[PDB]
Amino acid sequence: LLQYGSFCTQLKRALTGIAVEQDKNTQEVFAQVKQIYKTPPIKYFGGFNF
Amino acid sequence: KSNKKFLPFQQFGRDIVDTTDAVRDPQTLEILDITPCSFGGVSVITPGTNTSNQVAVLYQGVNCTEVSVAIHADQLTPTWRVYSTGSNVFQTRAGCLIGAEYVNNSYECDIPIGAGICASYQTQSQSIIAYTMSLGAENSVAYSNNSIAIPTNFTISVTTEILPVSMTKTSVDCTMYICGDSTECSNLLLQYGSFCTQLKRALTGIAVEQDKNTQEVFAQVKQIYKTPPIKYFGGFNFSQILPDPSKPSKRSPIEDLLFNKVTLA
Amino acid sequence: QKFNGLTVLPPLLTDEMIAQYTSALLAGTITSGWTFGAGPALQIPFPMQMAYRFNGIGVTQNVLYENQKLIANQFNSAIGKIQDSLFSTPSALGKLQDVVNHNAQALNTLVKQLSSKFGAISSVLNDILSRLDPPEAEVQIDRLITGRLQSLQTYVTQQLIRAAEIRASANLAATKMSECVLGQSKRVDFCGKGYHLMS
Amino acid sequence: AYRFNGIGVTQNVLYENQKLIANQFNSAIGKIQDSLFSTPSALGKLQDVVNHNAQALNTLVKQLSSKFGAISSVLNDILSRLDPPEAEVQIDRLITGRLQSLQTYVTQQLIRAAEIRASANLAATKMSECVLGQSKRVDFCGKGYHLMSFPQSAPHGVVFLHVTYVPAQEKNFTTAPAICHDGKAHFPREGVFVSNGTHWFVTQRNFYEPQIITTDNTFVSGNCDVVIGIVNNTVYD
Ligand SMILES: *[C@@H]1O[C@H](CO)[C@@H](O[C@@H]2O[C@H](CO)[C@@H](O)[C@H](O)[C@H]2NC(C)=O)[C@H](O)[C@H]1NC(C)=O
Ligand SMILES: *[C@@H]1O[C@H](CO)[C@@H](O[C@@H]2O[C@H](CO)[C@@H](O)[C@H](O)[C@H]2NC(C)=O)[C@H](O)[C@H]1NC(C)=O
Ligand SMILES: *[C@@H]1O[C@H](CO)[C@@H](O[C@@H]2O[C@H](CO)[C@@H](O)[C@H](O)[C@H]2NC(C)=O)[C@H](O)[C@H]1NC(C)=O
Ligand SMILES: *[C@@H]1O[C@H](CO)[C@@H](O)[C@H](O)[C@H]1NC(C)=O
Ligand SMILES: *[C@@H]1O[C@H](CO)[C@@H](O)[C@H](O)[C@H]1NC(C)=O
Ligand SMILES: *[C@@H]1O[C@H](CO)[C@@H](O)[C@H](O)[C@H]1NC(C)=O
Ligand SMILES: *[C@@H]1O[C@H](CO)[C@@H](O)[C@H](O)[C@H]1NC(C)=O
Ligand SMILES: *[C@@H]1O[C@H](CO)[C@@H](O)[C@H](O)[C@H]1NC(C)=O
Ligand SMILES: *[C@@H]1O[C@H](CO)[C@@H](O)[C@H](O)[C@H]1NC(C)=O
Ligand SMILES: *[C@@H]1O[C@H](CO)[C@@H](O)[C@H](O)[C@H]1NC(C)=O
């Protein structure tokens, strides 16, 4: 198999790029805010139920 | 040992992928399960060589007891081995991590490892530490049903965004690449049909689209507008983005910096 | 079964962290409105924020201030119906199931491709090596090599083509998160059917 | 002033803070050059394209020294040391290997070109919507309330400079949804009712500027026994 060149390096590079992009997708969608906000202990909002 | 109910006439055993997983001993009728020996990937975690020469090693998808047992019996193929102090081996859902000390502080991620675990180079002397990634600062807003908050001042902010537009246009000649200038090779290659016409068509389409991209992005306007000779706009200063006449290529200072910042047969 | 040289890597963010991000977004939009998406978060009572949104869609505030109880009841019932609607519909999350099905199918095909002969005496290398001499074994080994290389190439090309589409979907989802959750949208049919209030 | 009016602030704010706004803009522009001048991974997006293209070309060229199960990777010596009936058996293997290499290169190039085209389409939309106009889509032309944008050209790409308005120095207040007067309810035309502890004013939403409550900036439209949380005070005619 060593006589066929360098197809396997290309295969590894392609798969690694795919994995890194997979992580970047979730990072871009969900990490919008920079603070971790908390809701007050008393859950009254004028009659709306969340 | 296996708990498979072999009927008295089978010998082997297969699974969905159709590979052998059970067998029967000929001399003593007994069912033995067969499992492949452990294998996996190895990752190396390092800071820059400008900083230090220390490294950490991650064996992917394996428990730490198996790697320790294999090391003690000398059955692990990568011959090099980390010192493996009693207090710098850690077990994560990504595998076994050797060479980093786990602390229970939370920082912003530096080098991603796995399921929420990151690694960094800290002076605590200097060493490599592993920790759980921090999501951000905690904040609670003072909610009430008769209270409001109103700003009393402002800030003018400027930010940047960078976007690619086009790439390089290339062309390839089949006969030169495959056969050079040999006539026998060309006659032999002529028997394969018309792959080269398709290759040429694909590359030509790519090049034309490359030109069309820049045309669509930049040729928005139909007039060439000019700024007045007197550059007074009520106190606003646009000198850093307007063209610079002294230099020959007529580029703004920021454009010069950008063109010198990118390095390219 | 860990296959033969094939492995699956875990994602960087766990489910708890994603839930924490979602909880922070909910708390911010409930206690601040749209202010926290452009700067510091500024508190405001919820009915007044609803009045702001009615004013945003072209209705005066007195309508909400005089129909507050009815609006709250309608919202509560509408939220209550969602759980039942999702609880008893078979093809509700087919979009998320298709990804898993496709990935499993591709992996299974790649593994199953290892029992083919590709015009050789056997599909097992061990017996070829154990019953033939070196000068005659390579003539059989090379055919297996070519077939398996072709299989890997096909798998990788298909994976790239699928990843492109997944990325486009994620970009759309990020735009929707910015424009429908952190603000009020005027684009028609972008954040639901009707006049958008919130998400 | 038009743009401040577009983001929801009155014109007198700019006409009275013109010098401060100009100074802030000048400093913000000045900082961009330093920020870009001393950051290593600033233009990684533009560098990745060049790196990928060079890598692909280098792989394609290097693939020419493989044998693909033949005696030699050079055609000249194969032709110079073998007879025609035996040379083709070696030439065809090289032909197959090199054809496979070309096919792989072309497929990869097509897949990359698609992504480049998507990026260029996004850049064109941004040029139309943030440079030739003022945008109301959130986080499309920067973080904050959009004012304007400026384009600059870069090798194989474009750079946008977004100018935005950010509130600062907030204060807390007591508020109410309506004012009761003479048995009539009052709602603000635009703004919000605010109280500093003892007196009531009406202010615009994004900037503190209290005013006296009058029949000129409120409308009545109702009665005093329906609104929840109504506060009763005086409204001057
Ligand atoms: C908000 O809605 C929830 C869900 O409908 C309410 O919880 C229900 O309360 C009733 C009466 O106490 C119970 O009989 C139900 O079993 C509860 N449901 C669940 C799923 O726990 C809740 O009471 C509502 N909030 C308020 C303040 O009324
Ligand atoms: C709004 O913010 C600006 C910017 O900070 C304030 O101007 C500064 O005021 C301080 C105090 O006098 C000076 O030391 C700074 O030199 C000023 N900065 C500039 C750029 O001139 C301004 O005072 C604030 N407005 C209010 C009403 O507080
Ligand atoms: C607009 O900004 C530029 C850049 O800050 C100013 O140019 C500077 O002017 C000072 C004083 O004349 C010099 O000391 C600097 O060396 C200049 N910088 C450069 C890069 O040339 C320019 O003066 C400003 N415009 C006005 C009208 O003040
Ligand atoms: C042969 O092996 C079987 C399997 O254990 C055993 O039962 C039997 O006694 C053996 N017979 C001889 C002659 O070795
Ligand atoms: C991993 O090793 C730990 C430490 O001995 C052990 O408790 C655990 O059962 C092991 N798990 C697996 C899956 O081998
Ligand atoms: C880190 O956090 C606290 C420190 O007091 C402790 O409860 C926890 O067990 C620590 N984790 C360790 C030591 O692994
Ligand atoms: C909200 O109003 C209710 C009246 O139903 C009151 O009891 C409660 O204290 C108010 N909220 C806060 C945070 O005080
Ligand atoms: C307004 O008062 C509340 C209640 O004490 C406080 O939590 C909040 O921080 C105050 N706002 C400012 C801007 O100080
Ligand atoms: C509130 O405003 C009134 C109106 O002039 C003023 O007389 C009073 O002193 C103010 N109170 C406070 C606490 O600032
Ligand atoms: C004005 O408000 C006070 C306090 O809420 C209330 O007691 C009074 O009845 C109101 N005035 C009238 C005329 O109802």
mmCIF file with all atom_site columns, C-alpha atoms in Angstrom, chain B residues 42-111:
data_model
loop_
_atom_site.group_PDB
_atom_site.id
_atom_site.type_symbol
_atom_site.label_atom_id
_atom_site.label_alt_id
_atom_site.label_comp_id
_atom_site.label_asym_id
_atom_site.label_entity_id
_atom_site.label_seq_id
_atom_site.pdbx_PDB_ins_code
_atom_site.Cartn_x
_atom_site.Cartn_y
_atom_site.Cartn_z
_atom_site.occupancy
_atom_site.B_iso_or_equiv
_atom_site.pdbx_formal_charge
_atom_site.auth_seq_id
_atom_site.auth_comp_id
_atom_site.auth_asym_id
_atom_site.auth_atom_id
_atom_site.pdbx_PDB_model_num
ATOM 1  C CA . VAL B 1 42  ? -3.018  8.997  20.168 1.00 0.00 ? 42  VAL B CA 1
ATOM 2  C CA . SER B 1 43  ? -3.125  12.786 20.502 1.00 0.00 ? 43  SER B CA 1
ATOM 3  C CA . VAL B 1 44  ? -0.319  15.073 21.670 1.00 0.00 ? 44  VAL B CA 1
ATOM 4  C CA . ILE B 1 45  ? -1.089  18.301 23.540 1.00 0.00 ? 45  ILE B CA 1
ATOM 5  C CA . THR B 1 46  ? 1.616   20.953 23.546 1.00 0.00 ? 46  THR B CA 1
ATOM 6  C CA . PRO B 1 47  ? 2.055   24.676 23.986 1.00 0.00 ? 47  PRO B CA 1
ATOM 7  C CA . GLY B 1 48  ? 4.315   26.392 21.505 1.00 0.00 ? 48  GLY B CA 1
ATOM 8  C CA . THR B 1 49  ? 7.955   25.438 21.243 1.00 0.00 ? 49  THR B CA 1
ATOM 9  C CA . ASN B 1 50  ? 8.700   29.090 22.020 1.00 0.00 ? 50  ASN B CA 1
ATOM 10 C CA . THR B 1 51  ? 7.178   28.509 25.464 1.00 0.00 ? 51  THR B CA 1
ATOM 11 C CA . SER B 1 52  ? 8.335   25.079 26.654 1.00 0.00 ? 52  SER B CA 1
ATOM 12 C CA . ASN B 1 53  ? 9.036   21.487 25.630 1.00 0.00 ? 53  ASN B CA 1
ATOM 13 C CA . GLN B 1 54  ? 6.607   19.706 27.968 1.00 0.00 ? 54  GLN B CA 1
ATOM 14 C CA . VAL B 1 55  ? 3.789   17.672 26.416 1.00 0.00 ? 55  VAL B CA 1
ATOM 15 C CA . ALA B 1 56  ? 0.729   15.681 27.435 1.00 0.00 ? 56  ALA B CA 1
ATOM 16 C CA . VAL B 1 57  ? -0.618  12.537 25.782 1.00 0.00 ? 57  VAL B CA 1
ATOM 17 C CA . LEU B 1 58  ? -4.205  11.379 25.251 1.00 0.00 ? 58  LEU B CA 1
ATOM 18 C CA . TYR B 1 59  ? -5.034  7.756  24.466 1.00 0.00 ? 59  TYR B CA 1
ATOM 19 C CA . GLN B 1 60  ? -8.458  7.939  22.846 1.00 0.00 ? 60  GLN B CA 1
ATOM 20 C CA . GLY B 1 61  ? -11.379 5.740  23.854 1.00 0.00 ? 61  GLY B CA 1
ATOM 21 C CA . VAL B 1 62  ? -9.708  3.534  26.466 1.00 0.00 ? 62  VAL B CA 1
ATOM 22 C CA . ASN B 1 63  ? -9.738  3.065  30.236 1.00 0.00 ? 63  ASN B CA 1
ATOM 23 C CA . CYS B 1 64  ? -6.597  3.944  32.174 1.00 0.00 ? 64  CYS B CA 1
ATOM 24 C CA . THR B 1 65  ? -6.230  0.567  33.901 1.00 0.00 ? 65  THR B CA 1
ATOM 25 C CA . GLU B 1 66  ? -5.750  -1.210 30.567 1.00 0.00 ? 66  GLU B CA 1
ATOM 26 C CA . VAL B 1 67  ? -3.041  1.204  29.433 1.00 0.00 ? 67  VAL B CA 1
ATOM 27 C CA . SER B 1 68  ? -1.279  0.878  32.792 1.00 0.00 ? 68  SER B CA 1
ATOM 28 C CA . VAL B 1 69  ? -1.432  -2.930 32.634 1.00 0.00 ? 69  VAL B CA 1
ATOM 29 C CA . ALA B 1 70  ? -0.173  -2.973 29.043 1.00 0.00 ? 70  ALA B CA 1
ATOM 30 C CA . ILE B 1 71  ? 2.685   -0.639 29.991 1.00 0.00 ? 71  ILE B CA 1
ATOM 31 C CA . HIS B 1 72  ? 3.697   -2.775 32.971 1.00 0.00 ? 72  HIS B CA 1
ATOM 32 C CA . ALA B 1 73  ? 3.826   -5.871 30.742 1.00 0.00 ? 73  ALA B CA 1
ATOM 33 C CA . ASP B 1 74  ? 5.384   -3.983 27.779 1.00 0.00 ? 74  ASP B CA 1
ATOM 34 C CA . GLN B 1 75  ? 2.662   -4.742 25.243 1.00 0.00 ? 75  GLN B CA 1
ATOM 35 C CA . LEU B 1 76  ? 1.949   -1.234 23.893 1.00 0.00 ? 76  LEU B CA 1
ATOM 36 C CA . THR B 1 77  ? 3.250   -0.474 20.406 1.00 0.00 ? 77  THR B CA 1
ATOM 37 C CA . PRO B 1 78  ? 4.399   3.183  20.764 1.00 0.00 ? 78  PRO B CA 1
ATOM 38 C CA . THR B 1 79  ? 7.684   2.471  22.503 1.00 0.00 ? 79  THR B CA 1
ATOM 39 C CA . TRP B 1 80  ? 8.124   5.901  24.090 1.00 0.00 ? 80  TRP B CA 1
ATOM 40 C CA . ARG B 1 81  ? 6.466   6.400  27.461 1.00 0.00 ? 81  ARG B CA 1
ATOM 41 C CA . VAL B 1 82  ? 5.632   9.377  29.664 1.00 0.00 ? 82  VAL B CA 1
ATOM 42 C CA . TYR B 1 83  ? 6.953   9.324  33.229 1.00 0.00 ? 83  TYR B CA 1
ATOM 43 C CA . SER B 1 84  ? 3.433   8.701  34.606 1.00 0.00 ? 84  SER B CA 1
ATOM 44 C CA . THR B 1 85  ? 3.603   10.157 38.088 1.00 0.00 ? 85  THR B CA 1
ATOM 45 C CA . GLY B 1 86  ? 0.994   8.790  40.468 1.00 0.00 ? 86  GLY B CA 1
ATOM 46 C CA . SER B 1 87  ? -0.893  12.110 40.437 1.00 0.00 ? 87  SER B CA 1
ATOM 47 C CA . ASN B 1 88  ? -0.942  13.129 36.754 1.00 0.00 ? 88  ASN B CA 1
ATOM 48 C CA . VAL B 1 89  ? -3.179  10.488 35.158 1.00 0.00 ? 89  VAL B CA 1
ATOM 49 C CA . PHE B 1 90  ? -6.792  11.459 34.506 1.00 0.00 ? 90  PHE B CA 1
ATOM 50 C CA . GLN B 1 91  ? -9.822  9.672  33.074 1.00 0.00 ? 91  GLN B CA 1
ATOM 51 C CA . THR B 1 92  ? -12.134 11.577 30.728 1.00 0.00 ? 92  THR B CA 1
ATOM 52 C CA . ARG B 1 93  ? -14.975 10.506 28.468 1.00 0.00 ? 93  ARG B CA 1
ATOM 53 C CA . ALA B 1 94  ? -12.532 11.060 25.589 1.00 0.00 ? 94  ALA B CA 1
ATOM 54 C CA . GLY B 1 95  ? -9.998  8.613  27.038 1.00 0.00 ? 95  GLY B CA 1
ATOM 55 C CA . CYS B 1 96  ? -6.911  8.534  29.258 1.00 0.00 ? 96  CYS B CA 1
ATOM 56 C CA . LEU B 1 97  ? -4.858  11.705 29.756 1.00 0.00 ? 97  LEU B CA 1
ATOM 57 C CA . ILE B 1 98  ? -1.253  11.435 30.965 1.00 0.00 ? 98  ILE B CA 1
ATOM 58 C CA . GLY B 1 99  ? 0.980   14.376 31.822 1.00 0.00 ? 99  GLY B CA 1
ATOM 59 C CA . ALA B 1 100 ? -1.495  16.989 33.093 1.00 0.00 ? 100 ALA B CA 1
ATOM 60 C CA . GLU B 1 101 ? -2.608  17.858 36.620 1.00 0.00 ? 101 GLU B CA 1
ATOM 61 C CA . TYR B 1 102 ? -6.355  18.256 37.106 1.00 0.00 ? 102 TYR B CA 1
ATOM 62 C CA . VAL B 1 103 ? -7.499  21.276 39.108 1.00 0.00 ? 103 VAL B CA 1
ATOM 63 C CA . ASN B 1 104 ? -11.039 22.275 40.071 1.00 0.00 ? 104 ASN B CA 1
ATOM 64 C CA . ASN B 1 105 ? -10.974 25.896 38.941 1.00 0.00 ? 105 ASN B CA 1
ATOM 65 C CA . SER B 1 106 ? -12.888 27.071 35.881 1.00 0.00 ? 106 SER B CA 1
ATOM 66 C CA . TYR B 1 107 ? -11.318 29.176 33.134 1.00 0.00 ? 107 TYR B CA 1
ATOM 67 C CA . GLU B 1 108 ? -12.042 30.060 29.538 1.00 0.00 ? 108 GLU B CA 1
ATOM 68 C CA . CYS B 1 109 ? -11.090 27.195 27.242 1.00 0.00 ? 109 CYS B CA 1
ATOM 69 C CA . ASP B 1 110 ? -7.612  27.265 25.703 1.00 0.00 ? 110 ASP B CA 1
ATOM 70 C CA . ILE B 1 111 ? -6.989  23.846 24.097 1.00 0.00 ? 111 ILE B CA 1
#
